[PDB]
């Protein structure tokens, strides 16, 4: 029943798909664009801004952007991406199309396509709300290590853990983190036993949409298997606080990952479209079905 809005998606992606290393002009423009976009989609918007010294550049100002609908709800579904792009000395024009402009565009477009629900009937409840989290400073400035990585996520997890209104971080039922989406024929495996039921939901929704003739082409992206390895990402500081994670990161990685080829020209629209159809229904169904607190901390 939920229709595509590809005009919105495209125009959103165009607005984000600019060089946006933390501290750059493009990063500032994207931050402002995210905040404006969230406000216009009906979210209560907050920015978690902070300074931190990193390799190469010294002190930089980071800002996570968080939008919430039903901020006084008991629990939250949280959907996330990173909005910074990776600094490359020899590639100042790097735009990280899959990493993670498309992921961020997907979250905003999910909010757009379900707007008739999110901005109306969904507001009339106290059991669940929706959080969209745009992490800053996911990328290493010199070399990915536990230290040089995920600066925004580290800060936001600490912030959410340090507040009570139970701890704010504890009201997050699951962190659904989208990364490395946009390439052709992506494959998503379940990383964690505790969110396998949610993964199974994605699989079932994709099967159902295919049977209804609603998917483009012949690939299925949601695999019914547990992945044998893990991908380090923005959810690490949330694991550290026992938050359940559904990690929607394609493996294998896009061919273009961390190369000058991670651009608009190498995106695969039919895959993006299929992702959006499954994902928007997954989010709607999670919210629609919710009654009691979902407790996947096991
Ligand atoms: C959203 O953007 C994509 C990418 O530019 C558009 O897909 C292109 O559409 C034109 C017209 O059909 C084709 O000639 C190109 O081959 C497509 N390019 C790619 C990379 O797929 C799509 O049309 C846009 N959607 C809307 C609604 O404007
Ligand atoms: C080249 O293929 C891979 C390379 C590395 C890893 N493993 C990890 S733990 N990477 C951390 C990625 C952090 N990140 C996310 C977005 N931008 C940076 C897995 C790969 O294939 C499964
Ligand atoms: Zn990256």
If you count DSSP H runs as helices and E runs as strands, how many of each does the chain have, helices first? 8, 8
For this experimental structure, what is the resolution in angstroms?
1.8
Q: Give the DSSP per-residue string, 155-174.
A: HHHHHHHH-B--BGGGGEEE
Per-residue tokens: 102: 């498309």
Choose among 36, 252, 19, 13: nearest CA to 139.
Answer: 19
Q: How many CB atoms lie within 10 A of CB 88?
A: 16
Per-residue tokens: 243: 């938050």
Choose among 278, 112, 126: nearest CA to 207.
Answer: 278
Choose among 231, 228, 250: nearest CA to 106.
Answer: 250
The residues, any chain, with a CB within 8 Å of residue 227's CB and separated by 6 or more, are 189, 190, 191, 251
Binding site: residue ranges? 53, 59, 99, 119, 123, 139, 258, 267
Residue owning tokens 């009654």:
291
Per-residue tokens: 108: 């905003």
3-class DSSP state of 296: coil
Are the CB atoms for 287 and 127 separated by under 8 Å? no
Q: Where are the domains of the chain?
A: 1-298
Q: How many CB atoms lie within 10 A of CB 175?
A: 27
124 half-sphere exposure, CB direction, 13 A CA radius: 3
Are the CB atoms for 207 and 298 separated by under 8 Å? no
Does an H or E element contain 215, and which?
Answer: none
CATH class of 1-298: alpha beta
Strands 128-135 and 58-69 come out as antiparallel
Whole-number Å distance between alpha carbons of 42 and 53: 34
Choose among 184, 163, 181: nearest CA to 172.
Answer: 163
Binding site for alpha-D-mannopyranose: residue ranges? 53, 59, 119, 123, 267
For residues 101, 194, 157, 222, the Cα torsion angle rounded to the nearest 10 degrees is 0
Whole-number Å distance between alpha carbons of 192 and 197: 10
Three-state secondary structure of 43-109: CEEEEEEEEEEECCCEEEEEEEEEEEECCCCCEEEEEEEECCCCCCCCCCCCCCHHHHHHHHHHHHH
101 half-sphere exposure, CB direction, 13 A CA radius: 30
Q: Which atom of ligand 2 is nearest to the CA of 100?
A: 16
Taking 3-state DSSP, the helix, strand and coil percentages for the chain, each rounded to the nearest 5, stand at 40, 20, 40
Q: Give the DSSP per-residue string, 180-201.
A: S--SSS--EEE--GGGHHHHHH
Q: Which ligand is nearest to the CA of 14?
A: 1
Burial readout 36-66 (b: 16 or more C-beta within 10 A, e: otherwise): ebbeebbbebeebebeeebeeeeebebbbbb
Q: How many CB atoms lie within 10 A of CB 222?
A: 25
Are the CB atoms for 289 and 282 separated by under 8 Å? no
Whole-number Å distance between alpha carbons of 63 and 22: 9
Question: CA dist 253 to 153, 195, 270, Å?
Answer: 21, 21, 18
Crossing angle between the packed helical segments 269-289 and 102-113, to the nearest 10 degrees: 50
C-alpha of residue 214 to centroid of ligand 3, in Å: 31
The technique by which this structure was obtained is X-ray
Question: CA dist 270 to 3, 95, 105, Å?
Answer: 15, 21, 15
* Residue nearest (by alpha carbon) to ligand 2 atom 2: 253
């Amino acid at each position: 029943q939920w229709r595509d809005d590809e005009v919105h998606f495209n125009r959103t992606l165009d607005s984000i798909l600019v060089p946006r290393v933390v501290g750059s002009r493009g990063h500032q423009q994207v931050r402002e664009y995210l905040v404006q976009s969230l406000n216009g989609l009906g979210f209560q918007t907050e920015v978690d801004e902070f300074k931190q010294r990193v390799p190469v550049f010294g002190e930089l100002t980071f800002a996570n952007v968080v939008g919430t609908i039903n901020p006084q709800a008991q629990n939250f579904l949280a959907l996330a991406c990173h909005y910074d792009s990776k600094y490359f000395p020899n590639d100042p024009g790097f735009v990280g199309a899959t990493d993670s402009a498309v992921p961020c565009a997907i979250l905003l477009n999910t909010a757009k396509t379900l707007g008739a629900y999110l901005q109306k009937e969904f507001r009339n409840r106290s059991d669940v709300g929706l959080m969209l989290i745009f992490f800053d400073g996911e990328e290493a400035f010199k070399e990915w290590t536990d230290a040089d990585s995920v600066y925004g996520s580290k800060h936001l997890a600490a912030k959410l853990a340090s507040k009570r209104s139970p701890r704010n971080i504890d009201r997050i039922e699951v962190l659904v983190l989208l990364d490395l989406i946009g390439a052709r024929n992506p494959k998503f495996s379940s990383f964690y036993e505790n969110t396998d039921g949610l993964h199974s939901s994605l699989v079932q929704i994709e099967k159902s949409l295919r049977t209804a003739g609603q998917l483009e082409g012949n690939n299925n992206m949601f695999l019914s298997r547990v992945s044998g390895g893990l991908v380090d990402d923005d959810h690490r500081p949330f694991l550290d606080e026992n938050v359940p994670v559904l990690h929607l990161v394609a493996t294998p990685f896009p061919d273009v990952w961390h190369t000058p080829r991670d651009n608009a020209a190498n995106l695969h629209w039919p895959s993006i479209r299929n992702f959006n159809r499954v994902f928007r229904n997954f989010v709607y169904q999670y919210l629609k079905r919710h009654t009691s607190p979902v407790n996947l901390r096991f």
